[PDB]
Every structure is written in C-alpha cells, then in structure tokens.
Amino acid sequence: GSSGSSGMECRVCGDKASGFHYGVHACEGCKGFFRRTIRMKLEYEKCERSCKIQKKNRNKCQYCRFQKCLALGMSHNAIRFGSGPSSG
Ligand SMILES: [Zn+2]
Ligand SMILES: [Zn+2]
C-alpha cells in the first residue's frame, strides 16, 4: 500500500501515533521506551553524534531517543497517575 495517510503520526519516530501521550502524540513503541526510562530511572551517556530517531531505524540510539522525547516536551511529572498499589 505505502499510500498517503490522513491522521496523527508519532512525533518521536514518526510511525502512526496511538494518541495523546505526555502532551506529545507518541506511538506505542516510543511511549513504552520513555515511560520505562522514567519508572526505571535509567540513565544514558551523552551522545554527541546527536543521532536522528527515525521509523526505519528506531532502536538505533538510546540516549538520543530519550532526549528527543524531552525536547518535544514530554511531561515526566505525569507518570505518577492512577497506578496499582505496590509495596511502598
Ligand atoms: Zn514513535
Ligand atoms: Zn545518539
């Protein structure tokens, strides 16, 4: 098909977006990564190369990926909302 598209598309990678997520319309894939990096509080080394998160190559760079999310304006102080009761 590879035909045109009439709707919303991810802002991180580009692939069709699932909907409004953290202010930015991200897809299931990207979204997952972001949240994960938060809930897990994982860190990454500064990637000077400043790779470019694209659909064809999404799982290319980690740092850049997480960065792009922040640049777009991904709300980090939102993850904490309606969650299962876990050992506090
Ligand atoms: Zn995406
Ligand atoms: Zn990179």
From Swiss-Prot:
Protein name: Peroxisome proliferator-activated receptor delta
Record organism: Homo sapiens (Human)
DNA-binding region positions on the chain: 8-81
Zinc finger (NR C4-type): 10-30, 47-69
Subcellular location: Nucleus
Subunit organization: Heterodimer with the retinoid X receptor. Interacts (via domain NR LBD) with CRY1 and CRY2 in a ligand-dependent manner.
Record note on modification: 'Lys-48'-linked polyubiquitinated; leading to proteasomal degradation. Deubiquitinated and stabilized by OTUD3.
Expression across tissues: Ubiquitous with maximal levels in placenta and skeletal muscle.
Job description of the protein: Ligand-activated transcription factor key mediator of energy metabolism in adipose tissues. Receptor that binds peroxisome proliferators such as hypolipidemic drugs and fatty acids. Has a preference for poly-unsaturated fatty acids, such as gamma-linoleic acid and eicosapentanoic acid. Once activated by a ligand, the receptor binds to promoter elements of target genes. Regulates the peroxisomal beta-oxidation pathway of fatty acids. Functions as transcription activator for the acyl-CoA oxidase gene. Decreases expression of NPC1L1 once activated by a ligand.
Family: Belongs to the nuclear hormone receptor family. NR1 subfamily.
